[PDB]
Amino acid sequence: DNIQGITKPAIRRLARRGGVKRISGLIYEETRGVLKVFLENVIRDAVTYTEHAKRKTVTAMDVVYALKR
Amino acid sequence: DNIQGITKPAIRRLARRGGVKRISGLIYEETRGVLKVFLENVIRDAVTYTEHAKRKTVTAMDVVYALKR
Amino acid sequence: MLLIRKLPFSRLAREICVKFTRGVDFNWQAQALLALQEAAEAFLVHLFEDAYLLTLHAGRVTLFPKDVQLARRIRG
Amino acid sequence: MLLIRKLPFSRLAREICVKFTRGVDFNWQAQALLALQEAAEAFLVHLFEDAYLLTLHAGRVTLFPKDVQLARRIRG
């Protein structure tokens, strides 16, 4: 609950911040897909590292470690 | 001594192995440049790691470590 | 500054976490969920910049999914 | 199998090493110089494959330096 909560205006504005003014309508589902894959990998690694450390709360340093991979 | 020893036929054949049959004449110096940068980084890291280990001979495992970065 | 609303983002993160964890009890520091969102948005921005280089390479001004897929492929 | 001759490659590697080291005495195992060359050639091959995706994206069949530069830029 839920990838569809990443809205069309959010996506246009992210593309805009990256210097892209015009996008295909197909970009909405493309961005959703890319984002889900990125989070699946980072979250997996962040939580794995929290578990290796025998902790129950994922911290900013756990996320930073995950990102570094 | 010496980047020019990476020959034109070597470069064509590397491009060919990567599925590229036709290259611009400009590709020869482009490949030389890319190769030099790659080796500068890998060699730097491999030797740094040999030094950190207080050793005088760069090994295959030193190179493998460098590549992993 | 962040473009995605924090609540939709956190619901998506938690959902992905639970699918990985299959119910092991974890929770997130607010500073953790923020770090994650900041990095996610920066990732999307820089991917948009890379993919737009390919749009221009194709002689276009409109980003197509092929531009984003090529950028992803070349990334890793 | 390796496309670059081993002696030209080893001279280039040693030269780059000495420029970094500025004369600190190091030497290479034969298996080290081989590992390095194998990885260097595989790197060039895969870069050629990535860059050729961009050639086709530009509607061409001849690899141009812009294709290789874009691939490098997008890599990192």
Description of the structure:
It is classed as dna binding protein. The entry lists the keywords histone fold, centromere, DNA binding protein. The complex is a heterotetramer, with two copies of chain A (69 residues) and two copies of chain C (76 residues). With 69 residues, chain A is mostly helical. Chain A has one domain (1-69): Histone, subunit A (Orthogonal Bundle), CATH 1.10.20. Chain A is built from three helices and one strand. Chain A is elongated. Chain C is mainly alpha-helical and 76 residues long. Chain C has one domain (1-76): Orthogonal Bundle (Histone, subunit A). Helix content of chain C is 72%, strand content 3%. Chain C contains three helices and one strand; from the N terminus they run H-E-H-H. In chain C, helix 2 crosses helix 3 (65-75). The longest helix of chain C has 28 residues, at 30-57. The A-C interface holds A 1-3, 5-7, 10, 13-15, 17-24, 26-27, 30-31, 34-36, 38-40, 42-44, 46-47, 50-51, 56-60, 62-64, 67 and C 3-5, 8-9, 11-13, 15-17, 20-21, 24-29, 31-32, 34-36, 39-41, 43-49, 51-52, 55, 61-65, 68-69, 72.
Compact summary:
Chain A is an all-alpha fold and 69 residues long.
Strand content of chain C: under 5%
What's the story with the biggest beta sheet of chain C? none
Considering DSSP H and I runs of 4 or more, what fraction of the residues of chain C is helical?
over 70%
Number of domains of chain A: 1
Strand content of chain A: under 5%
- Count of individual helical segments of chain C: 3
